[PDB]
Amino acid sequence: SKVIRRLRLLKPHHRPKAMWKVGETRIPVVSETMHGVVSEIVHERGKVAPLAKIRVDTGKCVRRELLVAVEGNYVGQKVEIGDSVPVAVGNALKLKNIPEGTGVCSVERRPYDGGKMAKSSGAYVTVVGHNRDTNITTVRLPSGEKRSVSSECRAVVGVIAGGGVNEKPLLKASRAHYRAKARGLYWPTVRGVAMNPVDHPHGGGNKQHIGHPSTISKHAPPGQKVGLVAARRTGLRRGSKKVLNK
């Protein structure tokens, strides 16, 4: 049969274009505390979360840094990017100097990585605790995953601006159309059950049905990994996270 569309979208000519990206949004790696001014809060194509253009002026040069905008950023805000700066909203500092229970965002995964986690709209990471021996901070990710990360990792205080975008329903197909055209998603999505067998494992005959269990193994071949790819369970949840995970 032909190559399914899942494998066929993995080819690198289907990725979003690089010219839509305003710039890489990394927390600056600084020796001393860096004082910046939020120069502009800009929009990026596809990204609902806005970006914060941070202009840093020294004696020598002007550095132009880029961060994802925090809810409460404003143009002209003095931001401080350092190791032990104040823990106001908009600053970026190492997690050891961040008190527990404060929602941070653009958290680095490795130290001086530039910020990886909680980068899209409304996301934040709750700093749960500090292991001051072994230099380890346990943090709560927006998926609910409790993640260990080293206290040398930086993070920006606050939640990601761009708020509750999931609350608004797309009423029309056009609003899904222009959304996916901006983000570069593959849309509209034909159900594989509506396809022919040459197109899809769900591609069937005479009645639109799957025909075999749609829970596939995680060791499956690519081309078989279609539907629910490592499903621990299925069906409607109806329970707490505790009752379903175990």
Place this chain on the structure above:
Amino acid sequence: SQAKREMIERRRNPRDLDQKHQREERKALIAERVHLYRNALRIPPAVYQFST
């Protein structure tokens, strides 16, 4: 990418200096990375007797 260009600068990896004009820069870097590795290994008495 600017972070990666800083990343290949922090590590001093001679395999990053892959262009032709970087050749004399690369073999200077190879000479010092060999020298740090040569003396961090346990030099056997057959080689180390020439250090005396």
Place this chain on the structure above:
Amino acid sequence: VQHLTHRGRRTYNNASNQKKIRRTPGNRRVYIPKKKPGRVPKCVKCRSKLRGIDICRPAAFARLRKSQRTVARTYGGNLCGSCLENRILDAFLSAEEQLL
């Protein structure tokens, strides 16, 4: 009426192919190339219109005299007077309390 032709030129409706009608002496009208509208100078801070500076195309702007392209005070075609005065007050007052 005498119909208009782009007289051997491209007929597309781009910003750089705008035409304007001239009445030629024979009660004949033609298209002549209407140039691009010149950009208005704006304050770099507050982005209001800056007065004093001429509004022309960036090439025709450069052909003007140096007095027509700017205002005589400092941060002349960059800042308006209200943004400049604020910038003077900000650098002064930050310096004064820095001493205390």
Place this chain on the structure above:
Amino acid sequence: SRGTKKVGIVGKYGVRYGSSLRKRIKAIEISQHAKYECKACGKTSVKREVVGIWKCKACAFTFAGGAFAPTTSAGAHSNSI
């Protein structure tokens, strides 16, 4: 001359999309289109410019906020500390 008794701003959507979907988006379209008070100049002139960016049209004070409100509950809590 009210025009509509119950739907208000979602009368633009007509009879389409379902009553509960029109009822759900009504609170957000009131929220994302409203003018808000600028906390830098005092005037009720803050309008959304794009999702996540709210700008006062009087004193040009622009700030990064929520998607369809200037403030979210998670965003308010981090700033109140």
Place this chain on the structure above:
RNA sequence: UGGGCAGGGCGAAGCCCGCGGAAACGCAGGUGGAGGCCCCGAGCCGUUCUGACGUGCAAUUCGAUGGCGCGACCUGGGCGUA
């Protein structure tokens, strides 16, 4: 990266005034001009006639009828995917 797309109709918020109200607010008249709203022009398409044609004008066209017609559109060029 450029370009193209009559004229009407309905009248969403908001606003103004009048009337009513103890209040909350409610009616009414304007205003405003929203919407993958309505009829439709150029144009596009291809519902029906199972029309014409069916060694054709044409290796899919023609006519009437019909649908769409600021879009989830159409389009020139460049580019990508074999």
Place this chain on the structure above:
RNA sequence: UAGCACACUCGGGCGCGAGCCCCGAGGGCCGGGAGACGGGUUCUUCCGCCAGGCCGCUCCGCGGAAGGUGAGCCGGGUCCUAAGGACGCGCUGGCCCGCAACCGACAGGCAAGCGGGCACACAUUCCCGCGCCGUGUGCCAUGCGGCAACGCACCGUGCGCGGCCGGGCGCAGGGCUGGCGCCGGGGGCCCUCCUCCCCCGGCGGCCCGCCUGCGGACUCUUGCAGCACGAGGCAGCCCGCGCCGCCGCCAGGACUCGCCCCCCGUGAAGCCCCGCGCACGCACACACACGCCCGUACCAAUCCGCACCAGGGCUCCAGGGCGCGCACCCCACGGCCAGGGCCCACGCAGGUUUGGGAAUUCGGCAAGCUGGAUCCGCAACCUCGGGACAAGGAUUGGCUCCGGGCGCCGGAGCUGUCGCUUCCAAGGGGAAUCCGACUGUUUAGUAAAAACAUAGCCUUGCGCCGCACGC
């Protein structure tokens, strides 16, 4: 034989030869004129034809001989980047991939040319007039006014920091276009009537709007509103639109500023350039000199469909009337018109058919009815938004007036063989069921659908991702 021109007609001409070539007249018809791609000499002149053109030809996109394409300003290159490519090197057994010089736009960014003449044809290229832009040489000054908004010394180089963009209803302006009135040329027509018909006619002040000064609280807009972070007013300033000084009045208009609206869409980049900041050191004016390569004719029968094919093919420009209307229809501009005779049957296309009215038929297929506008009236149902132009009714011309808030609206009277959206244009409606929620999409060439898509709802994986409101 099938088939092939059958809105033209009359006179004249050249000519061996004329339905078709030319000229004049009459009658009609519809596009025509500029660019791209594509063609490549088809262009234009002279000569021809007994060949080609679905007939004929004296004609021709044909045959023969010639002629023609002139640029600092038009387009491209000598410029810049876009998406993207990449022949080098790394990684290789080879790719992929990494870096990526270089490249990538004849519609992006983007120095500067218009009016006319000439001409067989070609010229925004030649010519004439008036300009403009850039480059290269020379030749240096070393600053001021205004409280302010700012005004100016026609000056340079380097660095740093900055500096451009969407769509839409409306308001206002508006390249221009039309109409009317009045005046003015120029040309043609008229039994009566008719003033018929055709053509032509920088600079200063003010106004916006921002800002400034005085001053201190009001003030709009068609519209939300604005305003002590300074209202109106007055006096200025700035820079544009606009109007007067060196034919009026009315209407339409491509386009455009700003408000406002729309977006889970936020609407390029780079060079050039400009501004300021900080430095350097000097050349704008003026004068003189100079300005490369390529393209440049023509193509509603010149292209692609084997063809002068009823097909297809990017872009620009429509005057008058009617009317809501760049709808239809008529006219103008500009351009056109490709056998003869007879009409039997059966056709194709179009009218009309008394009485009946779906009895026809698988089925109201096809045809017909309704149709614009104004006024009135409008149900069940409903997601309260709709249904809805529901259903249904009345009216509609011409003329002469009257009134108004006067592009229009209302009323009255008179009038015609009762007739008036008089042509054109232009919904048939109701009661229900099934399915799909809707707008949308699809089998180019037998299926447009109930299929697909959709939003919504849900499940799954993922914290080595574009970073969980994510993919």
Place this chain on the structure above:
RNA sequence: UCUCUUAAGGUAGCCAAACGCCUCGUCAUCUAAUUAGUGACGCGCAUGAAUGGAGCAACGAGAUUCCCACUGUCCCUACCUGCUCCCCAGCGAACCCACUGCCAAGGGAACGGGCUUGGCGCAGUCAGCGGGGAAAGAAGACCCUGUUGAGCUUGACUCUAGUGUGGGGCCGCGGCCCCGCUU
């Protein structure tokens, strides 16, 4: 109420439905008359819950029935117009083609233009026409056969990319398989 049996025995709903074989189910309505339509009924061959059930506001060139109005759809046709046809000048093909006077019956490979026995017609022309030539199109697409395929599927056979696992190789130091370290 009893009993057998299953993983569980179809719940809420809905229905001769685009899903009901019987079947034109039965009853009502619609009609003069209805295998249609609608409303009911449900021991439903074989309805049924995101393989989504029920649900129709709005929408639809979707599928269907009734009513009003309308009409050449029909009773049942007629007339008119243009173009064709027809006739001509000039120009001028193709399909097809074993050979071809026409019937009746018979025989025959069981449906003849030719054979047999009868019946007829023949100046070979013009125009209509569609009975026949089992007319022309096209080495039947149905069906079967082929030890001829291809598309596609999976509990076919034999393999295989991918995912995953074990062991080994991948020349480093330290300390107690574990923990440090970096080179």
Place this chain on the structure above:
RNA sequence: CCGGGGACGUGUCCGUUGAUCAAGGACGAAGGCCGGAGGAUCAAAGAUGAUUAGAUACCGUCGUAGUUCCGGCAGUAAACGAU
């Protein structure tokens, strides 16, 4: 922290401003509903183990909605002092 309340005390003020109510408005336990978050216990439904003549119940175990919070709907109680 912000807000409220009644009683008392008083040569403080006002001076009849009041009482009760169709209409109207606001609040309104539990359960329920909508959107979002969360989910330990308990627990409708459901599932079982028993009891029983039967047991769709009482008992045991498990378990979803729910119980919880936020925004709203709803607007009911043996909302009883049946006043």
